[PDB]
Amino acid sequence: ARKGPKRHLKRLAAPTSWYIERKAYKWAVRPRPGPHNMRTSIPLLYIVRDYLGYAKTAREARKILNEGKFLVDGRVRKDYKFPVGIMDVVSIPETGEHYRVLPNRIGKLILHPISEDEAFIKPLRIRNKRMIKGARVQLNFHDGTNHIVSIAEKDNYFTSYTVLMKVPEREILEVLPFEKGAYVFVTQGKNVARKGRIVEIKRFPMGWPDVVTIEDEEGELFDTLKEYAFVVGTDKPKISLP
Amino acid sequence: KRQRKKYETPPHPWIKERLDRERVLMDKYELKNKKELWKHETQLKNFRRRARRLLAARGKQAEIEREQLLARLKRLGLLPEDAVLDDVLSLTIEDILERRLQTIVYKKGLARTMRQARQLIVHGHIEVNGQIIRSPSYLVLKEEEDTITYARTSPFANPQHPERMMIEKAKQG
Amino acid sequence: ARGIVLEKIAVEAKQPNSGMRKAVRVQLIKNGKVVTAFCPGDGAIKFID
Amino acid sequence: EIRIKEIKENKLIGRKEIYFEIYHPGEPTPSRKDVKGKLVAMLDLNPETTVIQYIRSYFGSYISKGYAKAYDSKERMLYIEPEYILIRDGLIE
Amino acid sequence: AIWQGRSLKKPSGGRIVLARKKRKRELGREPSNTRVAEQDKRKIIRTYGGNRKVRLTAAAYANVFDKSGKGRKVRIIRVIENPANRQFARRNIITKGAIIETEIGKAKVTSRPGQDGVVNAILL
RNA sequence: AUUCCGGUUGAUCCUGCCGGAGGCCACUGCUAUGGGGGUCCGACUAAGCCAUGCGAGUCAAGGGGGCGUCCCUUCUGGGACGCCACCGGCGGACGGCUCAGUAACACGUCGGUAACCUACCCUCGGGAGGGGGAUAACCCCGGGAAACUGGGGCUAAUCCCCCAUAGGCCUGGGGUACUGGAAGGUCCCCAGGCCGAAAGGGAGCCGUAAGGCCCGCCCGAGGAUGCGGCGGCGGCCGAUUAGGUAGUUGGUGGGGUAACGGCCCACCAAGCCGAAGAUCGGUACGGGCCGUGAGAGCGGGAGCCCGGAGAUGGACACUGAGACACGGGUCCAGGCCCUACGGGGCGCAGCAGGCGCGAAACCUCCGCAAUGCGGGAAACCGCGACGGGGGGACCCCCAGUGCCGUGCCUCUGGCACGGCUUUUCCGGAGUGUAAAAAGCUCCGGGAAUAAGGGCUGGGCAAGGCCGGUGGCAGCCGCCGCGGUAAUACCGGCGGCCCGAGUGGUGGCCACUAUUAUUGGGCCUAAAGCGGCCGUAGCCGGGCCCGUAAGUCCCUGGCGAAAUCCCACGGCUCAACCGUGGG
């Protein structure tokens, strides 16, 4: 039987979100732990070799990553197992090419191209708030990152809010709160890749999460859980959202 | 997981009536073995199964599959372009047998005889849409039916080849 | 199965059929039991010994 | 006769990837040297910095696909390319 | 092997066979049996995932905490009563909840010495 | 696609069973399987034994030595490359292999962990002070047949250690801000005690030095990878196994665990399970799926993916973040290999192969590459993972073994003449090897060069004459044939089915409304009890008021992939694969 951690991943076992030819070869690059969850990310090696076609074989992708000619949210990352998740900005300054990873209507992930001025803003979903000794508030984001603020600024934030972050230097720009009427992009569920406006809340006790009701651009009404309601704007989207 | 046979054996393979019907469908179209004929029956069969499944089926996806069924049947050239889901039932084995490439080449007059057409096909002297197909059992779409010509490098493409004029006069005669 | 013949035995058919059918008593290597084994084919038992 | 369908430029690698079709109706499939010599002509490339990946000749077809690769410097070619493809085209003994 | 594994008999009493051998994670350690003495003797134990557990084998001093909240690091004379087991009070063995006699008086222990390594108590 | 037919009588109807007729899986005869393209092979026996080679490493940018060479300078000595092995960081707990064990919270799904852990990863806040010590390699020296191994000098590390403070832990009192429905925890103060950090670094640019880039060390807090244990429901057979359990069930209070928990201990009490099948026995890895069938349904779990478990049987421990650890260690049992006999060491349910078993399953091959893993930031390295190839009537798709005109017959098929393609072979050129081959792809000379297996009385309609045998030899799935004229035996000829296949046996579903819910029978053939009563259970009068458990409709999450169906696209179409839909 198994006596410790897994170090491989059979291709057939790959997550459902990856555009990968499942019957090509046996294995797949097991992602290493990182910002996002297993469900909602992909190794950048597939992004380079496959989604961009820049490298055909893997060896040349090792080399191009070693040259550090990429900027994932304003940081060169040579770790080919790095997981690139939702709302992260892939930037190639050499070609001036900027894309943002977004989920598709089918639930897979895709690179939406974006302009340069958009490239340094990133929205972080405030996953939780934890106090650290010395009374320093710490916001844990949806992408395995943390930021520190003061006690007097704790009222400003709440869990599940969105924070548009100047990622290349880690500076808070604005905070999109939650109340009725916010523009929202859905991350998971059969309502994936849906953009609409918040209508109503649904409080359920007993560990049953909160459910929002979203109206679509034309007015169709549907429902989805809290944690999938990624707020991007209060009235209109602040980013080019397919 | 195993790859299963695509055709079906007769339930009783020694009925005189069915045996003779198979024989008279064999001699005319000149197929090699009963595998081919049973296969050609089989695609008809599951077309009918699809028709029956979708006729009773409700819901939008049923409509989508129905439209795709009609569309591909038309694209095959098996049905008139204004057909409905009804007349698909009344198809016959012969209807598919005309759509065989081997039949089509004979009906284009390029061959005096069935087996001659088959031999030319397997010998790669017949091209479709600029591409050579070596399977006389290949099924031809409607849209392709006018692109069937001699293979360009083949001598039979040459009008003066010693095997062209008897074909030609047989077509004329 | 694979076995060793130990003896040739003929058998009278069942009436109203009449005739003599040859066979051999065979000890079986797999488990050791002894069982009769009919020999088919006309003029064939000569080739079993 | 060679006719191109698409030429792409990997600025990250500094490389030109080109896909082309060889019409050779009634002709044997051409070698690597001849296709290289013809291809380098109209594209204005240094033949020593250009290599050909594959020339796939399909069944029952007179059009054979070909995929070729052109660098801008010797050392990127030496550092990125596997050795065996260079050996095939003769750029390494 | 001190095995803190599964029970071997069903709630109905059906005797369960062992389907698999014992694993490293499902076994405990020996009972510490803290005892009174003139000095404090301690031992560090490597545990699951590289953590450490400190274990006391001799006890000499205690932390008696006032109802107000102050603390006093005093010496231990003897154990008065051990409600957990009668054998332990006789043998001068200290565990949580034991009532012990010190220079201040009677103190009920509210710390586990086998894991904390220190004895904390509340006077009565 | 919802099919029947032969067999009980002098003749008929019925019941009932058997045989034919189809597919899948094993074994096997004959016959070739020529050609190609996508897939399988100790799957039920010995989880029996095994010679053998290979299958697991990488880093000298952490460290310090030695050896060789180059170059320059040579008292010295620097730098370049390679080797040596060591310290040491990481890996060797994943991957490969099998189904013995297990009737189990082993498994499937749905929830809870607030009752846990987490090395390599990401991010926010902070830190790297002082001091000390260690011995390999090498030089002197030895045993034994060996394994293996002694002793003196000797050296540095991010090797080891002490202290400094953060910080880790536990408790009493007092407040309060936060996740959250809440809990308790988290936040802060006071109080008491225990434990208790690091590591800098090779090269290079600028810089006199420093200082900026690169890699790396440590604390707090999360996230995330992997995991642990908790629960509801689901899913075999035996009643010629009816009572079972002894910490066995719960309560008090504690030990032990990373963690809750009788898990364990002490005391208390008598509980827990059973006819809705306890206990005991037989039997078996569970699931996605697979074979057959019109479908209800019936069966099966080997190849692929998930979870489970195991290394000759058993038992046990170190190091580790992770093991009681296939190619680490110790003992017993049992088997075996080497030896001046003091003692040693072995272990293919890894790849390839042998012995054994048996009806029954392959080459002691080539590369580290395409994919992917560990290491090294980088080059790259290794891998019997994997990828290629090798043998095999393993599965599915395609394909022919001649075509045409004339004349004669056996006019159905063949025969003779004339012409025609060259299904192979030979040569050249592409992929491709991450090398040749892979015969794949295009061109040139060119045979017309690969067709057999079964059946021929009827059920199966399915195909008829002549010789030999003469109740013998013989034939047969069932009925049935043969004692002189055999359309049923053997031979010849003829003919019929299928076709690179065909035949025989065994196993499974259909046939079978011969398991019957859909949907079977019990007056005379199998079967309504020799009678009545009545408990659980099952079925239950009408109307009115209420609930809304069942029932139905809408909507959130979820039930992985591969597989099933469909359109389009790619390999010549197809098998296979991709995108989209179900």
Side-chain angles (χ1 to χ4, degrees):
Chain A
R2 299 247 197 201
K3 305 296 203 168
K6 276 177 279 279
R7 275 282 193 264
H8 305 340
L9 179 63
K10 292 175 183 183
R11 210 188 211 83
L12 281 154
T16 59
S17 49
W18 302 1
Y19 285 94
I20 166 162
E21 209 295 296
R22 312 196 167 250
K23 272 178 170 172
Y25 323 96
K26 178 80 185 205
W27 328 90
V29 156
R30 168 164 214 84
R32 266 172 187 155
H36 295 83
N37 327 301
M38 254 295 142
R39 202 157 169 161
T40 44
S41 177
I42 184 173
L44 72 173
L45 181 38
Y46 301 131
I47 300 174
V48 165
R49 188 179 53 183
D50 315 328
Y51 283 57
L52 263 295
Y54 277 137
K56 183 54 60 193
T57 196
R59 207 165 202 241
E60 304 171 33
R62 329 292 323 100
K63 309 225 194 213
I64 197 182
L65 291 175
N66 292 340
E67 278 154 341
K69 304 173 164 197
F70 294 81
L71 277 178
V72 172
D73 304 358
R75 286 199 197 194
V76 174
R77 305 287 200 163
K78 316 177 183 186
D79 192 12
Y80 76 126
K81 304 193 177 202
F82 186 95
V84 200
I86 323 185
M87 321 286 198
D88 314 289
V89 181
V90 52
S91 304
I92 304 98
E94 288 77 2
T95 73
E97 274 177 332
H98 305 269
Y99 318 98
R100 198 161 294 214
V101 152
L102 272 305
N104 196 345
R105 301 219 48 68
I106 68 192
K108 293 189 177 174
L109 45 77
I110 196 59
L111 317 163
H112 171 56
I114 37 165
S115 74
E116 279 64 17
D117 76 323
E118 300 152 338
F120 44 55
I121 295 175
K122 175 174 184 186
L124 306 188
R125 263 284 315 287
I126 299 170
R127 218 210 271 203
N128 226 337
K129 311 166 79 208
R130 295 184 80 259
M131 273 168 188
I132 317 297
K133 283 192 174 189
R136 296 217 306 283
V137 190
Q138 182 155 52
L139 309 178
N140 320 271
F141 303 111
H142 89 273
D143 46 350
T145 62
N146 291 300
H147 197 283
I148 278 168
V149 311
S150 88
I151 289 297
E153 302 146 35
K154 79 199 178 183
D155 58 310
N156 155 286
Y157 306 91
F158 282 111
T159 55
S160 207
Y161 281 17
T162 306
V163 174
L164 314 107
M165 152 75 88
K166 198 168 179 211
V167 67
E169 68 249 48
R170 196 84 171 161
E171 284 181 357
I172 303 317
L173 307 177
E174 326 84 327
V175 183
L176 307 162
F178 165 109
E179 76 296 327
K180 298 193 178 199
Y183 207 75
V184 165
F185 181 90
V186 186
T187 55
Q188 292 193 201
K190 38 148 278 183
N191 300 140
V192 62
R194 289 195 94 172
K195 21 188 185 176
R197 196 163 310 291
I198 300 306
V199 188
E200 183 50 54
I201 205 69
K202 293 182 188 169
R203 161 149 175 110
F204 301 127
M206 307 333 290
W208 306 126
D210 230 359
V211 168
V212 309
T213 320
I214 290 169
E215 75 95 46
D216 187 29
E217 61 98 29
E218 77 268 356
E220 172 269 318
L221 294 157
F222 57 99
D223 311 73
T224 293
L225 315 98
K226 183 54 46 166
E227 79 300 333
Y228 295 172
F230 210 126
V231 192
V232 171
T234 186
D235 297 344
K236 323 310 160 213
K238 293 222 160 196
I239 207 78
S240 64
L241 266 174
Chain B
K1 73 208 189 281
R2 325 210 189 195
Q3 308 182 12
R4 269 209 74 87
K5 284 172 173 170
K6 296 295 185 181
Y7 55 97
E8 290 173 338
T9 293
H12 203 325
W14 288 266
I15 298 283
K16 200 91 146 209
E17 175 250 0
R18 309 216 210 182
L19 193 38
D20 287 79
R21 189 163 72 263
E22 286 178 359
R23 200 180 307 148
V24 314
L25 275 164
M26 281 265 168
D27 51 1
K28 176 187 164 194
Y29 292 92
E30 296 201 358
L31 325 171
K32 200 192 165 169
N33 49 52
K34 295 241 168 166
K35 297 187 225 72
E36 319 161 48
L37 182 56
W38 295 336
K39 146 186 156 196
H40 282 302
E41 163 66 278
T42 319
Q43 328 95 324
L44 186 68
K45 268 199 168 185
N46 40 345
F47 280 142
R48 308 190 96 208
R49 266 79 165 257
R50 288 184 65 196
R52 278 178 251 186
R53 180 186 63 179
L54 297 166
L55 194 153
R58 316 300 167 223
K60 54 147 294 307
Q61 58 275 38
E63 301 173 337
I64 306 305
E65 195 72 85
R66 172 184 309 142
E67 302 339 288
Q68 290 149 343
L69 164 59
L70 287 174
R72 208 219 169 168
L73 288 171
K74 288 175 193 186
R75 191 207 187 177
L76 259 295
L78 277 156
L79 266 292
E81 282 63 12
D82 36 359
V84 284
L85 204 57
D86 186 58
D87 40 315
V88 49
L89 278 89
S90 45
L91 278 157
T92 88
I93 307 294
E94 288 86 347
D95 309 332
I96 298 169
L97 288 168
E98 319 299 354
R99 304 298 306 163
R100 270 185 55 119
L101 193 141
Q102 189 181 342
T103 318
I104 275 158
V105 53
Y106 186 83
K107 301 322 295 167
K108 262 198 153 194
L110 311 188
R112 296 196 62 156
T113 59
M114 229 55 208
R115 196 141 277 104
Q116 181 174 38
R118 196 180 184 110
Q119 191 206 16
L120 266 307
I121 292 155
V122 54
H123 286 171
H125 308 305
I126 312 301
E127 66 184 18
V128 50
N129 211 19
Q131 177 53 43
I132 295 101
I133 293 185
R134 286 215 192 173
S135 40
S137 56
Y138 168 65
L139 195 52
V140 182
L141 285 176
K142 157 209 68 48
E143 49 175 323
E144 307 153 334
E145 68 205 13
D146 53 58
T147 83
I148 326 302
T149 85
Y150 292 80
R152 299 167 193 184
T153 193
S154 58
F156 300 98
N158 196 346
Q160 55 246 22
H161 185 253
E163 278 282 341
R164 184 128 166 188
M165 314 58 64
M166 71 305 297
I167 290 161
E168 276 156 356
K169 61 170 82 61
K171 164 56 218 71
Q172 309 337 300
Chain C
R2 170 197 57 188
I4 293 295
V5 164
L6 265 299
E7 184 38 74
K8 323 195 203 201
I9 310 96
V11 190
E12 209 207 319
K14 238 57 184 181
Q15 294 311 309
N17 226 20
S18 71
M20 272 275 287
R21 324 269 189 161
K22 266 61 69 187
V24 281
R25 266 201 100 184
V26 184
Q27 209 269 23
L28 155 57
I29 317 182
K30 216 160 187 195
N31 56 4
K33 281 162 188 164
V34 283
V35 169
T36 79
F38 165 64
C39 159
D42 188 5
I45 200 67
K46 331 307 166 283
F47 284 21
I48 305 104
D49 315 315
Chain D
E1 181 193 336
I2 305 197
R3 172 221 63 79
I4 322 302
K5 62 192 70 49
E6 192 36 69
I7 304 174
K8 169 173 109 187
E9 174 46 67
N10 185 314
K11 200 197 312 306
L12 280 166
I13 308 174
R15 186 169 79 75
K16 275 301 197 300
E17 326 93 351
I18 57 147
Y19 330 94
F20 50 96
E21 271 178 329
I22 299 156
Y23 294 68
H24 50 105
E27 270 187 301
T29 313
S31 164
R32 265 229 203 283
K33 287 149 292 312
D34 36 33
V35 298
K36 175 170 191 78
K38 186 221 175 281
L39 162 53
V40 67
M42 71 301 294
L43 259 294
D44 159 268
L45 330 169
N46 178 9
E48 282 67 13
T49 64
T50 59
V51 83
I52 317 164
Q53 283 67 264
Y54 61 81
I55 300 164
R56 256 56 166 275
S57 75
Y58 289 7
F59 175 75
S61 192
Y62 44 77
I63 322 173
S64 42
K65 312 298 131 287
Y67 174 45
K69 150 158 45 164
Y71 281 93
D72 50 23
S73 95
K74 190 75 56 164
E75 298 327 285
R76 303 295 284 140
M77 171 201 136
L78 264 290
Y79 168 75
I80 287 150
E81 303 280 56
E83 313 311 283
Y84 72 109
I85 78 185
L86 279 72
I87 297 172
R88 213 189 294 93
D89 304 39
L91 299 64
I92 289 173
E93 190 274 343
Chain E
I2 310 312
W3 194 63
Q4 308 205 345
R6 328 166 310 162
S7 177
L8 259 286
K9 290 173 180 263
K10 292 178 209 184
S12 74
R15 195 187 66 178
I16 297 167
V17 72
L18 181 65
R20 47 175 195 72
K21 70 207 164 193
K22 303 172 170 171
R23 314 301 194 171
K24 198 75 211 130
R25 68 186 167 267
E26 40 177 2
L27 56 101
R29 306 203 184 79
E30 71 96 35
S32 53
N33 318 338
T34 64
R35 280 188 166 167
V36 185
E38 313 313 293
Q39 56 277 69
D40 289 1
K41 180 59 204 70
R42 329 207 168 214
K43 38 184 70 169
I44 206 69
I45 296 164
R46 198 267 191 165
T47 72
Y48 207 54
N51 308 53
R52 313 172 95 201
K53 284 210 292 223
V54 77
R55 180 159 288 203
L56 198 62
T57 53
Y61 330 98
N63 299 254
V64 177
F65 292 93
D66 188 32
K67 298 120 173 189
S68 44
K70 90 185 64 49
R72 301 190 168 200
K73 187 226 179 185
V74 305
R75 270 213 61 162
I76 319 161
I77 309 172
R78 43 165 289 278
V79 51
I80 300 169
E81 175 49 56
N82 194 314
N85 187 340
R86 91 180 87 84
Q87 292 310 287
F88 284 57
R90 151 182 82 74
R91 293 171 293 158
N92 282 306
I93 307 174
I94 318 92
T95 45
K96 189 195 163 186
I99 306 176
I100 45 160
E101 188 57 42
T102 180
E103 41 263 42
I104 312 194
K106 307 190 181 145
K108 184 177 186 175
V109 179
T110 65
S111 81
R112 64 204 314 113
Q115 318 285 312
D116 317 327
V118 296
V119 202
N120 309 340
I122 312 176
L123 56 151
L124 319 87

